[PDB]
C-alpha positions as a Markdown table, in Angstrom:
| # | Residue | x | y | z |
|---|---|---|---|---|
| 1 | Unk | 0.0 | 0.0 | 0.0 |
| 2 | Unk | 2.7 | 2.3 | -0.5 |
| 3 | Unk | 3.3 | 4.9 | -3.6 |
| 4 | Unk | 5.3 | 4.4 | -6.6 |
| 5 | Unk | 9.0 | 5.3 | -7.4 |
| 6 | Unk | 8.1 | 7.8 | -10.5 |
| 7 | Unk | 10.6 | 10.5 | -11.6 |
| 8 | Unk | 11.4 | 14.0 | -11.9 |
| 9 | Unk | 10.2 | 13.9 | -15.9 |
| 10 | Unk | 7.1 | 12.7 | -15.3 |
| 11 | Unk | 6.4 | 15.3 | -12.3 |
| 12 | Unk | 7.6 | 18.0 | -15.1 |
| 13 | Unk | 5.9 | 15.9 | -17.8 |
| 14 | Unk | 9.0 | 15.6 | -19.8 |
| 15 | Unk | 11.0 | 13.1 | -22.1 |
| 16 | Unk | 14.1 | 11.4 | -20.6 |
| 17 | Unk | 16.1 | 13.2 | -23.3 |
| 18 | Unk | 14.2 | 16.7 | -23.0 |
| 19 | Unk | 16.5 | 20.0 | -22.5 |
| 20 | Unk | 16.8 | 22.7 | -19.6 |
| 21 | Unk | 15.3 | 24.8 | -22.1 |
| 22 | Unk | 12.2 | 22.4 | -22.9 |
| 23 | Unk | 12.3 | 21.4 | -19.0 |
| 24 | Unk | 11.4 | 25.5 | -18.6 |
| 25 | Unk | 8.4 | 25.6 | -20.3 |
| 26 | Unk | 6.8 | 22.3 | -19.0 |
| 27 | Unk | 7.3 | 23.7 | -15.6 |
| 28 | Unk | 5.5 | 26.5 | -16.6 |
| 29 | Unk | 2.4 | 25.3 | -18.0 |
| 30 | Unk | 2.4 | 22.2 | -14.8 |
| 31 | Unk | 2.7 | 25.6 | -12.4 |
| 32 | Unk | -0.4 | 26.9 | -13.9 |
| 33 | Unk | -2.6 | 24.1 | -13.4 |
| 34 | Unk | -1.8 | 23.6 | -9.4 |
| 35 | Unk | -1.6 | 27.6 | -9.3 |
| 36 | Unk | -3.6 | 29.3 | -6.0 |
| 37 | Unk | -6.7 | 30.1 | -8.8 |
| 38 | Unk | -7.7 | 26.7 | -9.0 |
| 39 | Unk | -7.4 | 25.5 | -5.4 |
| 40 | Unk | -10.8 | 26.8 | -4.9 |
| 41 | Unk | -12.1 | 23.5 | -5.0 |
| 42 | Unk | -8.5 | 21.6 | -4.7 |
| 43 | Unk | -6.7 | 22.3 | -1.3 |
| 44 | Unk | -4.1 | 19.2 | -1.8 |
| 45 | Unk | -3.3 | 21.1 | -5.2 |
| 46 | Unk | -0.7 | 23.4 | -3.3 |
| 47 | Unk | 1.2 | 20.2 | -1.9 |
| 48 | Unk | 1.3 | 19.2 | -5.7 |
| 49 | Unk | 2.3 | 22.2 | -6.9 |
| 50 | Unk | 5.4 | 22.4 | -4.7 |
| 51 | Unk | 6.2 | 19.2 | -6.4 |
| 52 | Unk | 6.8 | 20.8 | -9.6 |
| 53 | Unk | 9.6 | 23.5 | -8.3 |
| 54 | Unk | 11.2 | 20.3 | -6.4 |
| 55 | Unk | 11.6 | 18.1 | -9.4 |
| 56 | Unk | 12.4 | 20.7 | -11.8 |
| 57 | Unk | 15.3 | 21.9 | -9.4 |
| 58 | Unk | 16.7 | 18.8 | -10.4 |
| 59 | Unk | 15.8 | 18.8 | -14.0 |
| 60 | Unk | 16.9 | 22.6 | -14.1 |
| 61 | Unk | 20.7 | 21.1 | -14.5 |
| 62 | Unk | 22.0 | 18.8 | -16.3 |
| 63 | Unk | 24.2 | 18.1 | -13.9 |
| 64 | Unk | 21.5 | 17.1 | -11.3 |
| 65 | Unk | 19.3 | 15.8 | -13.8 |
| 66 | Unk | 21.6 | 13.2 | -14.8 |
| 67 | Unk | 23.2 | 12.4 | -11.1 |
| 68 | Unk | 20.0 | 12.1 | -10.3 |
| 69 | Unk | 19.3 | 9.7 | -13.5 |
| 70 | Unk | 22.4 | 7.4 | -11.9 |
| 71 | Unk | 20.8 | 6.3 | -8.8 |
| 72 | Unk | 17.3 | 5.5 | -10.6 |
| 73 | Unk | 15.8 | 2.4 | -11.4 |
């Protein structure tokens, strides 16, 4: 009964090969659906939506998207 082990990508919704350029935009657009306008009737959405900024730290580097990449399964 215990959650999966999904990555950073799929939190950002992108490809295994996407760019920090590409990686910018999909954070974007992910931000704007668990923005503060829409939590009217979604009060977990905030929790979500600090998801986004941690996996795309991550992602934001290639350097830390790729360590991070290393230890994965």
């Amino acid at each position: 009964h215990m959650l999966a082990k999904e990555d950073y990508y799929q939190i950002l919704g992108v490809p295994r090969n996407a760019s920090q350029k590409e990686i910018k935009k999909a954070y974007y657009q992910l931000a704007k659906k668990y923005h503060p306008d829409t939590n009217k009737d979604d009060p977990k959405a905030k929790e979500k939506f600090s998801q986004l900024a941690e996996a795309y730290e991550v992602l934001s580097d290639e350097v830390k998207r790729k360590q991070y990449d290393a230890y994965g399964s």
